Structure formats: C-alpha cells, structure tokens
Amino acid sequence: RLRADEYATTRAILKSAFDMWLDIIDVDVAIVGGGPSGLTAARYIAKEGYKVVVLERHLAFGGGTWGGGMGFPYIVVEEPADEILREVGVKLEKVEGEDGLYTADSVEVPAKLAVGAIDAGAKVLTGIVVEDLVLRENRVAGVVINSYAIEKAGLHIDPITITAKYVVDATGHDASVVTTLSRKNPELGLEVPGEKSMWAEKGENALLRNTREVYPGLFVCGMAANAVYAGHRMGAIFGGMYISGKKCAEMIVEKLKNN
Amino acid sequence: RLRADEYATTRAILKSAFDMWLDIIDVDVAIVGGGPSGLTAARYIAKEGYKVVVLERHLAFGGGTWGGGMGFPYIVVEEPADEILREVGVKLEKVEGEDGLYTADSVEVPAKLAVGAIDAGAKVLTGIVVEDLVLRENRVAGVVINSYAIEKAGLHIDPITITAKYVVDATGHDASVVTTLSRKNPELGLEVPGEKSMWAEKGENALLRNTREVYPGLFVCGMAANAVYAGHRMGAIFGGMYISGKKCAEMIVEKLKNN
Amino acid sequence: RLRADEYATTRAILKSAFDMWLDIIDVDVAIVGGGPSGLTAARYIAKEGYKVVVLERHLAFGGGTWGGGMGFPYIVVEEPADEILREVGVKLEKVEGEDGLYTADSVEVPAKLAVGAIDAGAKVLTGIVVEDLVLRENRVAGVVINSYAIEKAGLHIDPITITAKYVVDATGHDASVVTTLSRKNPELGLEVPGEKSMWAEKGENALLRNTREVYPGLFVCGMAANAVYAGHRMGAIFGGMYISGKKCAEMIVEKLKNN
Amino acid sequence: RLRADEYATTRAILKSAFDMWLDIIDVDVAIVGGGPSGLTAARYIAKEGYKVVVLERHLAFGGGTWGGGMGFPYIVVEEPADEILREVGVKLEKVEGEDGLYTADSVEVPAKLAVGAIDAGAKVLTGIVVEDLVLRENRVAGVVINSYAIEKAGLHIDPITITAKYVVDATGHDASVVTTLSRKNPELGLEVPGEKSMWAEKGENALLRNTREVYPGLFVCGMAANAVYAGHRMGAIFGGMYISGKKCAEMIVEKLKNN
Amino acid sequence: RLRADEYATTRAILKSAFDMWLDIIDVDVAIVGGGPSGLTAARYIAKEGYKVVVLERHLAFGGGTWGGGMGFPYIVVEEPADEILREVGVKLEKVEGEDGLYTADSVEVPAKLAVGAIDAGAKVLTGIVVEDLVLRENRVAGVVINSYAIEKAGLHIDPITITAKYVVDATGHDASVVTTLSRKNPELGLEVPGEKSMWAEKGENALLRNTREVYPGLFVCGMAANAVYAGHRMGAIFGGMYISGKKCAEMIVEKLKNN
Amino acid sequence: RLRADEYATTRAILKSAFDMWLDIIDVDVAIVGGGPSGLTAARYIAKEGYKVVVLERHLAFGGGTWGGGMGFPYIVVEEPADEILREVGVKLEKVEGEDGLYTADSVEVPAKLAVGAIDAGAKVLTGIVVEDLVLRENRVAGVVINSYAIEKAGLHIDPITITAKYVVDATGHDASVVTTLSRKNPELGLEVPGEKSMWAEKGENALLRNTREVYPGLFVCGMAANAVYAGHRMGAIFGGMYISGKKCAEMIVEKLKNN
Ligand SMILES: C/C(=N\CC(=O)O)C(=O)[C@H](O)COP(=O)(O)OP(=O)(O)OC[C@H]1O[C@@H](n2cnc3c(N)ncnc32)[C@H](O)[C@@H]1O
Ligand SMILES: C/C(=N\CC(=O)O)C(=O)[C@H](O)COP(=O)(O)OP(=O)(O)OC[C@H]1O[C@@H](n2cnc3c(N)ncnc32)[C@H](O)[C@@H]1O
Ligand SMILES: C/C(=N\CC(=O)O)C(=O)[C@H](O)COP(=O)(O)OP(=O)(O)OC[C@H]1O[C@@H](n2cnc3c(N)ncnc32)[C@H](O)[C@@H]1O
Ligand SMILES: C/C(=N\CC(=O)O)C(=O)[C@H](O)COP(=O)(O)OP(=O)(O)OC[C@H]1O[C@@H](n2cnc3c(N)ncnc32)[C@H](O)[C@@H]1O
Ligand SMILES: C/C(=N\CC(=O)O)C(=O)[C@H](O)COP(=O)(O)OP(=O)(O)OC[C@H]1O[C@@H](n2cnc3c(N)ncnc32)[C@H](O)[C@@H]1O
Ligand SMILES: C/C(=N\CC(=O)O)C(=O)[C@H](O)COP(=O)(O)OP(=O)(O)OC[C@H]1O[C@@H](n2cnc3c(N)ncnc32)[C@H](O)[C@@H]1O
Ligand SMILES: [Fe+2]
C-alpha cells in the first residue's frame, strides 16, 4: 500500500532544489562539460575536499562517449590511462595483438565516470549551459549560466551566475567557454584556432602540454585543450582525455592549497 | 609517452562490437526502455543469471528522470521503494514533515540504476529503437530494432532482430511496444487507452496490478503499465516505477524457471 | 555610483522565487490562461481576499488581444462591459454612429488588465503550461504544471503540481484544460465539440450561459466556454470575455463562501 | 442582453487604426524597443509633453524581463534606481543582508512600466520591426518600419516610415538599429563591437557614460549602449537600464527645448 | 515454399558486414565521392589489382548525375570520353548537327559506372561521410569516417578510420576533403578558392591540368579539381569528369608501382 | 583537346528529353516504385518485348535496399530466389551453417537490378511521383505523375499523365498507389489494412498469394502486397520481393498476350 501525495511531492522537490541552488552558487571550481575529461577532473578535485560543480548542457552527462566509434558501442583506452577507469569500476578487455590497449562498453564508462565524480563529492548539474564568464581585474571569477530548455526553446531570458575561484573549459571540440571569452573580450588577445586533423599519437601527447591555465582563473582540458592550442584529434581513444582531466585537477588542487 | 594508432583503435572497436552483436541477437529477455522501471527490471532479472538486454532509443539511458520535477533536479521515492535505490548506492534525504518519503539527486539516480543493471550482468544498448515485434503462433518471440540515428535521420533502411523468450515494454507514457503490437495486429483485440489524469496515490497503487503479461511473451512495467490499463499518472514520484520493475522481473524469473 | 554584485543578484532571485513557489503550490483558485477572461476572473476573485494564481503559457500575459483585429491594434467593447475596462483605467473612445460601443488600444488593455489582477492580489505566473489535472473522487483538485521552456524545447521532464479548490479553464479557443480532462478520462463523458462559425450577437450572449462548472472543481470562461458548449465566435469584440470572467469569479466566490 | 455586430466591430477597428496611423507617422521621438530602458525613456519624454512612439518587434512589450533570472520570475534593482520603479507602482521587497537592493515580480514590472509610458502619453506599437533608418544630411531623421508578421512570415514586402526628430536604439544586446546604420553606411565609420563578459559593477556604471548620441539624431540606451561602447553585461539587475533610459530622456528633452 | 528465419537473416548480415569492415579499414586507395569522377577512378585503379574503397555520403551512389540537366534526364559526353562510357555498356545516341557529341540516359549512367567499379574489384560503401583526414609527417595517410545517419541526425558520436596509401577527393563542387585539410591545418598553406563561372570549353580542358596531387597522399579529380584550382564549371557535360577520373587513376597506379 | 559548348549541351539534353517524354506517355505497363520488386517486375515484362516504364520518387533507384540491415550493408536471399539475382550478375556468398541462404552487397544489388531492367528494355524514370490514377469504366487506365522536386518544394502545380494498360503498385510498405485509389474512390470498397508484425517465414510465403490484381488494371507486388492483404513483414530478406516481382510480371505478360 504505497503512500503518495501531489503537494508533498512538489513541495519536497522545491525544498531540495532551492537548498541545492543557494549552496551551489559559490564554489571552488566550476567545470563546464560533463564529458570524460570534465568528470575525471571533477572526481580528482572533489576527492581532495574542495567544492566542485560540473555544468553540462544536455540532460544526461557523458558528452560524446555514448556512441563509441561510429555507433559501435565501444571506446578504447591505452596505458597508463586504463588505471583511471579501473579506479571507477569499469570492466576492461585486452585488445588482441596489442599490449597496453583496452576496450570498454561505451555505455558503462559514462555511468561509472559520473558515479566516481558524485561519490567523490562533486555536484553534477545537467540541463545547464554556460553562456559567458564573470570577470574581475585580469581574471575569470565565475560562470554565467542558463538552462538548456531556455536555450533550445529560444526564449529571451537572462542568465544567473555561479561564483568560482577556478573555471574549467572541458567542453570538447568547440572549446566553447574559451571561445566565448576570446570573442567577447578581443583585447585579451586570446585565440582559439581549433584542432588539426587526425594524428592519434601526436594528438594524445599534445594534450598534457595543452592542459593549462589559458587566462587567469580559466583552465582547459580534454579536446578543448587541443582546440585552443591547435593539437591533433585522435579518434575514439580516450586515455588522453582521462589523463588531461586528472592533470587539470592536480594543477588546480595545487593552486587552491597555495592559498 | 602515450601510444595510439588509428587503425588499431578502429580495429579494436570493430572487433568488440561485432562479438557483442553476434552474442546479443538471442537473449532470454529484451527490455525496451532504459528508464527507471526498465533498468530496475534488468538488474533483478540479470541478478538471477539470465541473459538480458535493455534497448534504449536515446544515446544516454535514464529516460524521463534527469530533469526531476519541472527542471528542479530532484525526484521523490516513498517506502518501501527507497530500499531499491539504497541497493544501488543512491543517497537519500528525508523530506521534512513526511515519514517514509525521500528525495534523491535526479542525475545520481540514473547513473546508479544503470551501474546496478550492468554490474548484475544486463547489457544496455543505447541509440537503438524497437520499431516492431517478432511474432510466433499466439505470442511475441522477439524485437525488431533499428538505430536512433537512422530513425532521426529519416533514412529508408530495414531493421534487424533480437530473439527473446520474453519482451518487456518499459517505454514510459507512450507504451510504444504494446501500442505498435495492437496497431499493426488489430485482430489480437489489444487496446492502449492511455493514462488518466494525475491522482498520485491511485496511480502508484494501480501499477502493481497493471504490471503483467499483456499478450504471451510481452510484459509491461513502469508508466507503460498505466497507459495500457488506464491507470492514473503520479508525478515525479518513482517508488511505483521501481517496484513495478522489480515485480516484472520476479514474474519473468518465475516463468523462466518453470521452463 | 551604482552598486551591483553577481552573487547577490543571483542569491536574491533564488530566495524570492523559492519563497514564492513554496507558497503558491496550494491556492484557492488556479486560473489557466492570462488572456482577457482569465485576468478579469483573477481580479474579481482576488479582490474578495482569496488566494489566486493565473498560469499562462507565454512569457507575456494578454493572450490573443495584442494584435487587435488582423494586426490593426484596437479592440472593441460594448456596454455594459466597458465599465469593467474603466475600472482598470483603460481609455475608451466612442465609435462613430454607434451607441454603447467603444474602441481601446490593444496594447493598453492587456497591461491594465494585468495590473488590475496583480494589485487585487492575484499572482500571475508566465512561462507555465498546465498539461493535466489533479483528480480526487468525482472532482478536479488542482493542476499539473510544466514550463513553456521545457514544452517548446521538447525535453522529457516530469511536471509538478498546484493544489486548488477550484480550477478555471480560461485558455481561449482550444479549451485545453477541459479538452485534456475529457480526452484522458473518457469515462467522465465530457466532450468539447468546439466553437461554431461567427455570429457575434449570438456568440456574445451564449457566453454567460456557457460560463459554468463543467465538472466538479472545474469552471470554464471566455472563448473556452463557447468551445465547450458549441457557442458562436464573435470576432474582435471583448465585452463577452470580460463579463464571462467576472461572472465566473462571482460563481466561484459564492462557492468559496458557502464553505 | 449584449449587442454586437461584425461590420460595426470591423469598421470601428479600421477607423481607430487608420486615425492612429495618420497621426503617428510623424513624431518628436521614435524609441525602438519596448524593454525596460525603452519604456522608461518613453515615460520621461512623454511626461514633458512631447510626441513619443515606442516600436517593439514582439506582440507584447517587456523585452527580456518576463523570465527574470533563468526562469525564476524575479528581477533585481539597486538604489537609487528603485525609485524609478516606485514611481510606476511596483512592489519592491528588500534583499536579506543587502542594503539598497530589492527584488520585484518579473511579470509585474513590464506591465507597470508600460502603463507608466502610456499614461504619460507615449504611444506603444507592438508587432513592429524597425528594419532601417531614414537619413538626411549628416543625420538620422526617422525609422523604416515593417510588421513582425511580415518579417517572421518571410514575405517580400516593402516597409513604410515614421519621421522623427530623434530616434533611440533601446533594442537590447543586439543594438540592432545602430548596427544596421553602421553596416549599411560604412563610410560613417560607426562600429558596434558588442558587449564584454559579465562584470556587474563595471557594467552598470559604464551605462551612464555609454548612454548618448551615437550619430546625429540617434541615441542609444539600455544594454544597446554597452554593445555599442563595449561595456560589460551585468546579469538580471536592472537599475542601470532604468537610469540609462531616464538619462536618455533628459538628454533628448534638453535638445528638444533648445529648439 | 520459401524458408526464412529472423535470427539467421540478422546473423548473416552481421557476419558479412563485420568481415567486410575488418578487411576494408586498410586499403591502397580511398576515393571520397561516388559520383562519375570517383567511380571512373575506382574502376581504373581496381582494374590493375589494387585494393580500392569508394566512400559516398548518400545511400545511393551516382552523385549529381541522376537529374541530368535541370531535371531533364539526359547527360552529355564529348569524344574521346564517350569511349569510357562504352566500356561500361552505356547506350549513347548522337546529337543532331554535332560531331563527337552524345547523350545518355541519366539513370543508366550511374548504374553502369557503379557496376564497372564493383566488377573491377572496387568496394563501394554508401551512407559514409569522410569528415577529416589521418595525417603523418608531411602527408595524408587515410580518412576519418562517420555515417551519414549520424551526421544527418546530428548525434555527437566519434568517427573511425580507414588507412590508405592514397586518398582521392572526388567530392564534386565543394572539394570537401581538400577544403577540410586546408581549413583545419592552415600552416600547410593550402587554399580552395572555388570554381569560376561557366565556360564549358575552358572548364573541360582545365580539368586535366587540375587533376593532381594537391598535398602528398591526396589527389583531386572531377569538379573538385576545378574548385581547388579555380577552373570554370562546364554544365551537364561529363567527358571531363570521366577523363579526369581516368587520369587520376593512372597517376596513382604509377605511384603504387614505383613502390 | 576537349570540345564543349553550353548551347549544344543544353540543346542536346532538351531534344533527347522531349523525344523520350513524347514516347513514354503511353505504355503497356507503368510500374510505380524502383525498389527490388519493381525492378524485377520491369525486367521480366520488358524481356518479353512489351513497353515498360518504372516511376520512382527518389532521384536514385533501389528503394529501401541500400542500407542493408540497420546500416550493415548486406542483404539476404533464400533459394530459389538467389537465381533471380544470379541472372543479373550479383555475387552471392553462402551463409555459414545455413543451406540455400546467401548474402549480397547492398550497394551491388540495386545497381545490377537496375541494369537488368534497363538492358531488358524497361525505361526507368527517377524523380517522379505517382500521385493518383487515371480511371475508366471499372478500371485503372494509367497514372497521374508529378516531379519529386515539385512535391518536396511544396509548389502548387498540376500533374501530367502516363496512359497504361496495366499499372503496378511496387511502392513498398506504404502501398501508396492502392492506398490513394481506395482513399479517393471509397465506393470501390478497397481497403489497405497495412502489414502485420514480423514473422519472416509466414510473411515471405504470403507474398505469392498476395501478388495479384487488386482492381482491374492495377496489380500489387513486393511489400505493398502484404500491406494490401495484411501479410507479415520479414526483415532484410528479399527472396520474396524478387519472386513477387517475377510472378507479377508473368501474370501481366499472360494478360497482355490474351489480348
Ligand atoms: C576523444 C574525442 N574525440 C576524438 C576525435 O573526435 O577525433 C571526443 O570527442 C571526446 O568525447 C572528447 O571528450 P571531452 O571531455 O573533451 O568533451 P565531450 O565528450 O565533447 O564533452 C563535452 C561536454 O560539454 C558539453 N558542453 C559544451 N559546451 C557547453 C557549455 N557552454 N555549457 C555546458 N556544457 C557544454 C557538451 O554537451 C558535452 O557533453
Ligand atoms: C513517473 C513518471 N511520470 C509521472 C508523470 O508524468 O506524471 C515518469 O515519466 C517516469 O520517467 C516513467 O518511468 P518509466 O521507466 O516507465 O519510463 P521513462 O522514464 O519514460 O523511460 C522510458 C524510456 O524508453 C525509451 N523508449 C520509448 N520508446 C522506445 C522504443 N520504441 N525503443 C527504445 N526505447 C524507447 C524512452 O527513450 C525512455 O528513455
Ligand atoms: C474574442 C476572441 N476571439 C473572437 C474570434 O476569434 O472570433 C479571442 O480569441 C479572445 O482573445 C479570447 O479571450 P480568452 O480570454 O478566452 O482567451 P485568449 O485571449 O486566447 O487567452 C488564453 C490564454 O491561455 C493560454 N493557454 C492556452 N492553453 C494553456 C495551457 N494549457 N496552460 C497555460 N496557458 C494556456 C494561451 O497562451 C492564451 O494566452
Ligand atoms: C539587463 C539585461 N541583461 C543582462 C545580461 O544579459 O547580462 C537585459 O538583457 C535587459 O532586458 C536589457 O534591457 P533593454 O531595455 O536594454 O533591452 P531588452 O529587454 O532586450 O528589450 C529590447 C526589445 O527591443 C526589441 N527589438 C530588438 N530589435 C528590434 C527592432 N529592430 N525593431 C523593433 N524592436 C526590436 C526586442 O524584441 C526587445 O523586446
Ligand atoms: C559536371 C558537373 N557539374 C557542372 C556544373 O554544375 O556546371 C557535376 O556537378 C558533376 O556531377 C560532378 O561530378 P563529380 O564526380 O565531380 O562530383 P558529384 O557528381 O557531385 O559527386 C560527388 C559525390 O561526393 C559526395 N561527397 C561530398 N562530400 C563528401 C564527404 N565528405 N564524404 C563522402 N562523400 C562526399 C557527394 O554526395 C556526391 O555524391
Ligand atoms: C523487404 C523489406 N522490408 C522488410 C521489413 O521491413 O521487415 C523492404 O522494405 C524492401 O525494400 C521492400 O521492397 P519493395 O520493392 O517492396 O519496396 P521498396 O524497397 O520500399 O521500394 C519502393 C520504392 O517506391 C517508391 N515510391 C513510393 N511511393 C511512390 C509513388 N507514389 N510514386 C513513385 N515512387 C514511389 C519509394 O520511394 C521506394 O523507392
Ligand atoms: Fe540580458
């Protein structure tokens, strides 16, 4: 005999949401993009006890991972990055005739990446678009957010804000946060040239160098890093994404400690 | 120094996918819909050692859970259904002034439901649409599948099939599998009247009665059950969905054992 | 020297909105539609001290009034209904060769109707769609609401609820609330035949008879009344809309007092 | 017993509309945009007895105010700008822990701003798009108007004109009037760089400096001012918009008196 | 009495497709575009025993040939190019008052061109989009592929790869492969100016000069050649297309033999 | 040194097209649909010396064959139907563990089917939609045709006609010709119930019985036959389609000879 009431359900949702919102509008780190790089970054920062929010446009997390390679629902990871997936429980299978190369179910990975982030203490908000940055003297000091619903519906409605010590552009190929900063504030002299064509080995190894603070308060990781610094793309192999996100976390953790 | 090759990445994805496909085209149970009811059903069946596939249209699982209530990212669960979420690790918080009523993060729940299903041994395939049924004498004997990409692109391309002992319509409000069966085979005398307006208590309690075998080989659970048997909708409270999915699993497990 | 902060602006909006929401989810009367009939009804009920919310799909109130007649930005009103517009401050100009017939600026009217409603104490919420009803034994006991943004974006997100003693369908030509009730709960034997063609005099006078309780807890007024009871349409003359809304208010006020 | 006739209704609308049109095609000031800055400007100019028309694309006035902040239906105002809203009857509530900061119902504000403008004598026309300017030797001498219906329908139909001594671009973020002037007449050497990212305090204070005559006969106010002069955006706080509109009015009133 | 089974049909399609895919991901030549130039090139290369794949976006081959001239279903060919169509069985009819000029059924030609390519040993894959290139030191070493379904559906899914010694852009007017190379890797200093207006004689004769290796590993033929080198277009006369494709084949065969 | 002229190219296309059109507007048989069933039917009728035209909506022939099964580019054929594909040169490969079952490249098949039809003397016109029938006393005496361009563009342009002794609906799942006849001429008492769900063996064997003259002058073959007579669908196995088309041809050849 289940017990359920409309008013109580509605009231409960409103109370949890409004408590959540009042808390989440000031954070240590706001990561933009709930793909593999962003969710990895979120886990490793939150793991150290800092207050982290991930903002993802789509209602589901996962970014461009779900469809694997051309719809074939597996993705690839190379050592030592496989270890990052093992930490969150992902089953990995060896590739035939290839040492240190593994495949994983493209549906399993996002789920487990997200759980890792949430259980480490990161808050993941979906249906939220970062449309701009909050600025202070010589730095990025937060994000300007709107709902995916409002964006996709095309309604003329103003955004609200989340204040952050650090922001991370983990938005994938488009590097949409860095792109917006550079476009609306041209006097900063930032440029997003976009990625080069596919060269997997060069692309993967460029990511670690390209994962860094682009402007004070704003880091970039994942494919966004190679868009900002013109690295090569690498196809459906994700070790670089995970290591990039992990590295981004370590850099930001260091800066948070120094203060 | 990361090691990566385009051919090896591509080859690896192809090999894992084609092994997966050759195995998955005959199953014990094909569940249609990767929402809360479908993912719960998948866990409880796979948990007993049977071969289960979930087929979900969208690239991400989770169904209509991600947005909580009107975008406020929390959902509600009432006892004893809260216990089903605790089994998969979901954090629950008590609702103020309400006994046996809990809220949960609307992003956390789908992630953990999916992990539960997959770790129990269920295979979850996304970007797959069930467009029809495979029939035998007096029963449903499988599903007719196409890709979401092909559907959304509008391309005129034929489906393939997955053979199953049992099929479950866990497709939500539309009851799209039962609806298709009844529409294309009118001589079966099936009808999908659709749900009634909102009455949460009546809706929740109708679900258990409405979770059943609609035609031999075809079960229904979740909101689809109330669409097929004209139960009330209940709003953003999910205990009924979880219990319905669990019950559906138990019914089907019993039938599989009897054979 | 203006003082402004992002966090404070955001916090302030969140606090006012969440206080508003927690209060508004239980009301005496929920009026659906912020057109001329709905806004008039709202004023006359709130004026008597009852707790009223108007729910309007579009971000602006006003319904189908703004464009006047075929874009010519004037609407017409006939006595004694002109008196209802005078009560909210609308300037009226006599029509040449016609006694008891006036024109009014089609932009002025909605503005002043809305102010009248708000200053009488009615809450007007825009960007909100009533998609269904909350039911109890033999009656309508509230509304099921979602955002226009979510509807127009096509996102699969559950609604929340507002509990009410009375609901009013003031949704215009479509009578969308009565239509939904009748469609989803066919055993109630309700039908919405839709309006007849234009006969202004017959249409206007049918409205008063057609303004009534269609099912316990659910009233209808404005053009919705003639859609439900197959009255004629009347063109860009609005006296009937105002009187219908006023009458609807009086009927509901009486029922609230009797309890 | 209501009296209504189709021919009389139609005739009445035609007569009022055509009288209105013949009068409105020559004005002192044509304000483009019926948002908060434009409606404030309109009130303060009309208040001094000058002939003002506001031209707004959408059928409703209000611009980007209705949805508050990310759909939460409240907006913020800081002193002394709160006084401008009090003049038109808006209820304001103090923000907790913040002096000189208030919230207001995002539906109430547009309604009351519009009433203020109309009751001061400004004419507000909606469903009208300014697509270009009328030019004379070294100045803007009017606006080129079409209907929103014609624009949105994509029909190839010529515009008509309203002659004005002064035109005001109060079109918001896009600064669409100044942008069009600069694009079609490049030899004027005007440029619209567009706004910078969010810095609320700097954005708000830049508005007063940025509210000015961009080219003889053409003023800019509201967010359009910061688009033209590359000021920062400020989020859902509106004091700057109101003060900008008020200042724009005072500047133009002075110029009208000097002649 | 026909014999048919769902599982066997599905299994058979999966086995043939996965064998095909594992073989086709490394080739001698990957031709992009299954129009007249691409299909001619494919025949003449495969004819010499090399491993060739043609990748075509649309589900059918044929490119822009099917509609003839403005829907009139005939195309034109001039000597000696007519001989290339005779080799694949196309019926040709002399044009009245014109020596060495022939018409052919615009539906017959693509069919026979495709058969010629396939029977020579070329594999033609349709519904496949080349979205990028695989690069090595100073050359193009393969293609980055996705499905047309995924592209047209707008899904965020990663591509896979086909390794090749040589790639051919036979994509028609857009020269989409060379364009992508030049856009994403600007430091290569490639440019695609696009075709000039129509001058048939000059356009046809420019093609042979313009058919060449644009960058090491990447050839161009057909209309793509005149887009890359700013040749004139020629209208619905195709001799240049066939000769260009044939020449492209000969050049690449020579390079393959030299190694 | 290629010779090409714009006027001569244009003139040549016009002359061939207009000769073609003047000839093709009266035929023995008009087959609607250039899929596998229609192209097979066309070959076997034209082979006997009769005047046949195939009318296909899309610019390419092939119907729903190109994509194989869910994009995997192979289709299946069972004996003795494999013999029909061997007659037109298609390479077939045996399915492992299955006697009398073969796979074929889904791109090769349409090409070779089309060549078979054309070389047998059938005219195939693409980009042509049959929108209606020409009627005489108790029979269908031709087809009403428009262009796909006109249909897809939505232009209000009248059709023209092709006179035929027999018309064949080979339009696939929709049975669009029979459907149109039955819809517009209800007094004929025709009905198109549509196909049943998938049962491959029953679907394949129903086709031969269902391939027949539905109304005097109008035959049906391919999947259209099972739509008209409520047979089962069979998935991506095509033997039934080929045999159905062949049988349709034989029936019509017999009727032509008897006259
Ligand atoms: C390896 C690879 N490609 C190789 C190749 O193509 O050769 C990939 O594409 C990987 O998926 C890249 O992973 P990565 O974590 O870098 O990005 P992703 O998966 O695309 O995730 C980014 C996420 O960010 C989201 N997003 C975008 N912009 C915004 C915004 N302004 N606000 C909120 N969210 C936003 C977007 O929806 C997405 O979920
Ligand atoms: C409680 C509630 N509502 C109360 C109220 O509204 O008042 C809900 O709406 C719940 O979300 C319902 O849960 P439930 O597990 O029943 O369904 P869901 O969440 O909608 O998930 C079903 C899933 O099934 C998917 N789906 C649909 N049809 C197909 C198809 N033919 N093939 C593949 N997948 C398909 C669809 O994408 C969706 O993800
Ligand atoms: C006199 C006349 N016509 C004569 C003739 O045509 O001959 C008119 O059309 C009048 O405008 C009718 O006035 P009335 O007050 O009856 O309606 P209106 O102006 O159309 O306002 C109704 C409002 O209700 C809104 N609405 C609709 N459905 C929903 C929903 N389900 N939830 C939330 N809001 C909804 C809708 O957006 C609209 O704004
Ligand atoms: C404070 C803030 N943002 C902060 C932030 O984003 O960080 C805002 O966006 C405010 O709403 C800005 O107020 P403001 O009065 O400047 O503009 P608004 O509200 O956008 O109103 C302008 C109106 O003008 C209209 N309009 C546009 N272009 C034309 C045209 N060519 N002809 C006719 N009308 C037109 C347009 O439809 C709109 O209604
Ligand atoms: C003579 C003439 N015009 C004269 C005039 O207009 O004056 C023509 O237009 C001829 O058709 C040109 O023949 P040609 O073989 O050069 O090209 P085509 O017929 O357009 O075929 C190219 C094919 O290539 C395809 N394609 C494009 N881009 C991609 C991609 N990125 N990946 C996969 N396939 C792609 C495209 O779909 C098309 O089918
Ligand atoms: C076996 C199978 N399915 C099994 C399953 O799904 O379970 C199939 O779908 C097969 O492709 C069916 O082959 P068949 O030759 O019957 O049909 P098809 O391939 O769909 O070809 C019909 C053609 O006819 C065309 N067409 C449609 N209507 C019109 C019109 N009014 N005028 C002109 N042409 C038209 C249409 O565009 C199409 O190209
Ligand atoms: Fe704004």
Ligand SMILES: [Fe+2]
């Ligand atoms: Fe089919």
Ligand SMILES: [Fe+2]
């Ligand atoms: Fe729901």
Ligand SMILES: [Fe+2]
């Ligand atoms: Fe013009």
Ligand SMILES: [Fe+2]
């Ligand atoms: Fe990618």
Ligand SMILES: [Fe+2]
């Ligand atoms: Fe006609």
